[PDB]
């Protein structure tokens, strides 16, 4: 439209540093958190294999 | 020579009335009867035969009357190859304490600048061996380099490590210019290089000199170190057909001072609160700073981004220039991510394919696309949840964060604040580690894994690490 | 004594007629005993800024020089007196028996008398001295909103001095200097009170210039104060100067300089502003030891308003500081107090200005609260006790752990006794709103029964691992029998 009329962008969310831009930032945190666990004891088991092998 | 009289002293602005023949403008005038020495530059030709003159030291002790010698010339300083391993004061006064600066030839600060035709067309790259800068914002040799960033963000911290990983390999000498930087840090970098090496004070191989005006320095003095470094530094390019690299802290006092300075000038204020002359005289400062036929200048410029505001006037138009620049983002910095350089704010003209390479070009550009589809997917985060994405968008954040954290690089500035050893990355292991990450090869690997590491054999090493100790 | 004649006196400024060998920035005296400084050298006349109310000046009145720049009585003989901004006893105790004078306007110490910053300068408060520690010789900026505790921490810094000002190495004897700038004479009288019932006055050095004091001497003040520390910093002894308010003399300057006719720039405030405040910072270094090795730490206080940082005064300063101690009003009110906001609160290590015993576990303390930070801000809670369940405990244990009382400053060993029991999990099952219940009592118990304890950890300055199996024990033997 307009290009007078204030435009946003992605992650202006996450910019403005308000509760929605916390709660994201935790969101993600705990999501890869838990994952990066999953990640590790999987690889701790590829290694237990290895070394079995 | 035509010995003028002060007749004002307002702040640093010292107006002298000649009743001979006036100084041209730009002229040295000397204070007689001081203790030390006090050097006021022309600033302008008021009239009735009385020149406004800015103060290039404290401006206190002067009484109306007072009689002031005319230099003939511009500040002229001690230039050549004797300042390596010193450090000079804006007047070109030895400060270091080790008796006088024995040069053969005198150059004044204030000069013209490079020709068009004298222009060089060459684009090589220089390999710092930070990841973020060699892989999205490659620096080039001679080229001139800006460190945008705000307070706190990590300006000096890189320029020191770029002084570290390039200077010390660097065979051609270096000129520091401390322009309105903290006095601790400077006798920080000082010492820091004496023991390094590249100041030797008993042997006379030393490979970087100094020139320092601190804040601590009147406005007039921070407002001319800048020009005094540089004037160094076009001595080790035309004199001597040398590649020099000149490193400046925080360009932006050289314009700062002048907006400290133009209300008693008698100036109109700019925008913001700038002077009126803000653009033309940082031209004519950074034109100067150019690698012309004769020799090559590398400059690394520090820019401090007043608020964090990159559209105040003063960073805004160093921008222009400037061949690559590297903008350190706070929030990255707050993210923990160090060096801050900001993967899609950071640009260099020597990006292109032509230039860096097809594999290069594609992997950077890659790079930067993933990590803007990340920041918008973070907006849908907010709302929907993590547990909410397809499985192609959780694919491309964890793909993202992983990039963003193997960015982050440990320096060896920085083993003092991290506490980790630092590594340097050479460009095609960067170029490989983010290719393989892009492709997603270490998927399956944590993004602990990535963050404040080298190379990606070190990303995946790390890995293992965490899992033996699981 | 070369004369002027006071052609117009209005609003402290004196605009002298005469006066031919002035010296800029030289003090000049007037009819009626007012002293003043000379800015303003025009061509006919002299800019003058009264030191004081301008009423008993009139046109027709004669200054004369006083011959030197403005100088402060400096020395030692200035601790313990509350004395104003040009070295005048306002504590009613008597004339202080100064025998040296130094400038107020001094250059500061260049490149080669510096030395890296070593010493620690502890505050007393857990949370500066170990997530945000400050050496000797480093400018920390207390910046923070209305209030919110920075007159508090200073305070409390000043306080604690005395466990080391009251020993008998000079080293670790750190003489205080506070500067009251536009502080109403109450608020001041407050502080002295204060110091005066803690003993902290015997060691510092209150320079006042309240808001009844003149523009022309709150601009003064922190120069002022910043040379008495200066006299301690060039003689080999430690000093630390709290200059309460900068922004204060920000407007003080920015009075002083639109009547002086000097025309306005940002905010009114004039283009230097910036020097002004450089300037002063500069100064306190940490000298090397062919200078005498002693040290001026600088503790700037600078009031934001609405909490915006990127404010011009604000920045200015922020940009002078080695670091920043941020305090916000939304963790005052919401129990974290002191209020500092560690994540944004930094401070460059001081090379090393943090005791071993303390690094211990404040490295890990630091690495388990970003992390508590960066997983528990969401208050939407779902299911992960492993991972997040396990830090967030963590990371508010801690934070109970960091919070802490007004004018109570706590020694070092004991923070690392306290930072010891929180960070090593074993206070991890105790319950978060009884933490500091545990804090307080623990403190007590080590201090009455384990004494020889906090002795071996001052004395060696790192925790062995036979002092930490001793701290094991003892913890763990309170912990079991801490609830009755
Ligand atoms: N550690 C603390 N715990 C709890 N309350 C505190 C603490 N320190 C200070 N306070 C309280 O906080 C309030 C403000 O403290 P303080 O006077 O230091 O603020 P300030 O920002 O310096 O104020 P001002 O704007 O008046 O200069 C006072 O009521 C004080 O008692
Ligand atoms: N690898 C790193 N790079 C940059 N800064 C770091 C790093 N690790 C820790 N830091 C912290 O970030 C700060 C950056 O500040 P500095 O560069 O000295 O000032 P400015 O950012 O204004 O130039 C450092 O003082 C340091 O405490
Ligand atoms: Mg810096
Ligand atoms: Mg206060």
Request: net charge negative.
């Given at each position: ?28 945190e ?23 092998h | ?9 307002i ?19 000397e ?11 022309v ?10 003159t ?8 002067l009484?109306?009357?007072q ?7 511009p ?9 390596l ?44 061996g ?14 001139k ?10 300006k000096?911290?890189?320029?020191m ?21 903290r006095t ?21 191989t030393?490979?970087?000199?100094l ?28 004199q ?51 690698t ?13 981004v ?7 006037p003063?960073?805004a ?24 350089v ?12 032509n ?25 849908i ?16 954040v964890?793909?993202?964060?992983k990039?963003?954290?193997?960015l ?28 393989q ?9 944590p ?12 990303a ?11 | ?10 609003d ?11 010296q ?9 005993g ?22 008993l000046?009139?046109?027709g ?5 006083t ?18 901004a ?37 505050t ?11 050496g000797?010789?480093?400018r920390?900026?207390?910046?923070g ?49 204060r ?6 006055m ?12 003149a ?5 003064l003040?922190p ?9 301690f ?43 002004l ?13 062919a ?6 730490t ?12 990127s ?16 305090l916000?009003?939304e ?30 576990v ?57 930072i ?12 978060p709103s ?17 004494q020889?304890?906090?002795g ?29």
């Amino acid at each position: 439209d307009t290009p007078e009329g204030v435009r946003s962008g992605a992650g202006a969310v996450r910019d403005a540093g308000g509760a929605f831009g916390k709660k994201e930032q935790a969101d993600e945190e705990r999501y890869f958190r838990a994952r990066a666990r999953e990640q590790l004891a999987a690889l701790k088991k590829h290694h237990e294999n290895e070394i079995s092998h | 020579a035509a010995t003028g009289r002060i007749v004002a002293v307002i702040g640093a602005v010292v107006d002298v009335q000649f009743d001979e023949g006036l100084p041209p403008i730009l002229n040295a005038l000397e204070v007689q009867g001081r203790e030390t020495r006090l050097v006021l530059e022309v600033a302008q030709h008021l009239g009735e035969s009385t020149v406004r003159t800015i103060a290039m030291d404290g401006t206190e002790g002067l009484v109306r009357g007072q009689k002031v010698l005319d230099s003939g010339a511009p500040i002229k300083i001690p230039v050549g190859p004797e300042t390596l391993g010193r450090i000079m004061n804006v007047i070109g006064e030895p400060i270091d304490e080790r008796g006088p600066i024995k040069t053969k030839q005198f150059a004044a600060i204030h000069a013209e600048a490079p020709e068009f035709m004298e222009m060089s067309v060459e684009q090589e790259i220089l390999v710092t061996g930070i990841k973020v800068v060699d892989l999205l914002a490659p620096y080039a040799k001679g080229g001139k380099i800006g460190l945008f960033g705000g307070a706190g963000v990590g300006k000096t911290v890189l320029i020191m490590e770029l002084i570290n990983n390039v200077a010390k390999a660097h065979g051609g000498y270096s000129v520091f210019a401390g322009v309105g930087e903290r006095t601790r840090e400077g006798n920080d970098l000082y010492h820091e290089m004496i023991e390094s090496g590249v100041i030797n004070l008993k042997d006379a191989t030393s490979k970087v000199a100094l020139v320092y005006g601190q804040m601590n320095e009147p406005p007039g003095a921070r407002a001319r170190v800048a020009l005094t470094g540089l004037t160094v530094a076009e001595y080790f390019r035309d004199q001597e057909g040398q590649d020099v690299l000149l490193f400046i802290d925080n360009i932006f006092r050289f314009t700062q001072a002048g907006s400290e300075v133009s209300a008693l000038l008698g100036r109109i204020p700019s925008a913001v609160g700038y002077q009126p002359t803000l653009a033309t005289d940082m031209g004519t400062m950074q034109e100067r700073i150019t690698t012309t036929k004769k020799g090559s200048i590398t400059s690394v410029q520090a820019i401090y981004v007043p608020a964090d505001d990159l559209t105040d006037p003063a960073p805004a138009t160093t921008f222009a220039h400037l061949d690559a620049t590297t903008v350190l983002s706070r929030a990255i910095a707050e993210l923990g991510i160090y060096p801050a350089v900001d993967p899609l704010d950071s640009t260099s003209r020597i990006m292109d394919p032509n230039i860096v390479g097809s594999e290069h070009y594609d992997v950077a550009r890659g790079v930067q696309k993933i990590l803007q589809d990340y920041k918008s997917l973070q907006d849908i985060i907010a709302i929907l949840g993590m547990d909410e994405l397809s499985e192609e968008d959780k694919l491309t954040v964890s793909r993202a964060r992983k990039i963003q954290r193997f960015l982050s690089q440990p320096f060896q500035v920085a083993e003092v604040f991290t506490g980790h050893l630092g590594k340097l990355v050479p460009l095609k292991e960067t170029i490989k580690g983010f290719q393989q990450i892009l492709a997603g090869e270490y998927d399956h690997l944590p993004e602990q894994a990535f963050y404040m590491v080298g190379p990606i054999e070190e990303a995946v090493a790390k890995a293992d690490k965490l899992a033996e100790e699981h | 004594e070369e004369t002027g004649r006071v052609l117009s006196i209005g609003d402290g400024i004196a605009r002298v007629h005469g006066l031919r060998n002035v010296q800029a920035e030289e003090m000049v005296e007037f009819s009626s005993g007012l002293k003043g400084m000379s800015l303003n050298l025009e061509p006919d006349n002299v800019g003058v800024v009264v030191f004081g109310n301008d009423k008993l000046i009139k046109e027709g009145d004669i200054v004369k020089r006083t011959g030197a720049i403005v100088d402060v009585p400096v020395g030692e003989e200035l601790l313990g007196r509350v004395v104003d901004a040009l070295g005048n006893a306002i504590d009613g105790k008597g004339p202080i028996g100064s025998k040296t004078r130094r400038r107020v306007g001094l250059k500061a110490p260049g490149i080669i008398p510096r030395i890296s910053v070593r010493e620690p300068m502890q505050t007393g408060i857990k949370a500066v001295d170990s997530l945000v520690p400050i050496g000797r010789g480093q400018r920390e900026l207390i910046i923070g909103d209305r209030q919110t505790g920075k007159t508090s921490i200073a305070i409390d810094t000043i306080i604690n001095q005395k466990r080391f000002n009251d020993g008998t190495d000079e080293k670790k004897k750190l003489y205080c200097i506070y500067v009251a700038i536009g502080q109403k004479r109450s608020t001041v009288a407050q502080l002295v009170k204060r110091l005066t019932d803690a003993d902290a006055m015997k060691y510092t050095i209150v320079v006042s210039a309240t808001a009844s004091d003149a523009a022309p001497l709150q601009y003064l003040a922190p120069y002022s104060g910043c040379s008495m520390g200066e006299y301690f910093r060039d003689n080999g002894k430690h000093a630390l100067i709290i200059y309460d308010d900068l922004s204060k003399q920000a407007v003080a300057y920015r009075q002083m300089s639109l009547l002086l006719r000097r025309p306005p720039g940002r905010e009114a405030y004039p283009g230097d502003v910036f020097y002004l405040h450089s300037r002063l910072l500069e100064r306190a270094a940490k000298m090397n030891d062919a200078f005498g090795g002693g040290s001026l730490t600088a503790l700037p206080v600078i009031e934001t308003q609405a909490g915006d940082v990127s404010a011009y005064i604000p920045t200015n300063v922020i940009s002078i500081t080695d670091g920043q101690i941020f305090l916000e009003t939304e963790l005052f009110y919401k129990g974290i107090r002191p209020a500092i906001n560690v994540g944004l609160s930094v401070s460059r290590v001081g090379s090393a200005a943090q005791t071993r015993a303390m690094k211990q576990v404040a490295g890990t303390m630091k690495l388990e609260l970003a992390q508590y930070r960066e997983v528990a801000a969401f208050a939407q809670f779902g299911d992960l006790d492993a991972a997040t369940q396990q830090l967030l405990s963590r990371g508010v244990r801690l934070t109970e752990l960091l919070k802490q009382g007004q004018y109570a400053p706590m020694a070092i060993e004991e923070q690392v006794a306290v930072i010891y029991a929180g960070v090593r999990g074993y206070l991890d099952k105790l319950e978060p709103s009884k933490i500091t219940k545990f804090e307080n009592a623990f403190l007590s118990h080590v201090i009455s029964q384990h004494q020889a304890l906090l002795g071996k950890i001052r004395a060696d300055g790192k925790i062995s691992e036979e002092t930490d199996a001793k701290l094991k024990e003892i913890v763990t033997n309170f912990l079991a029998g801490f609830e009755a």
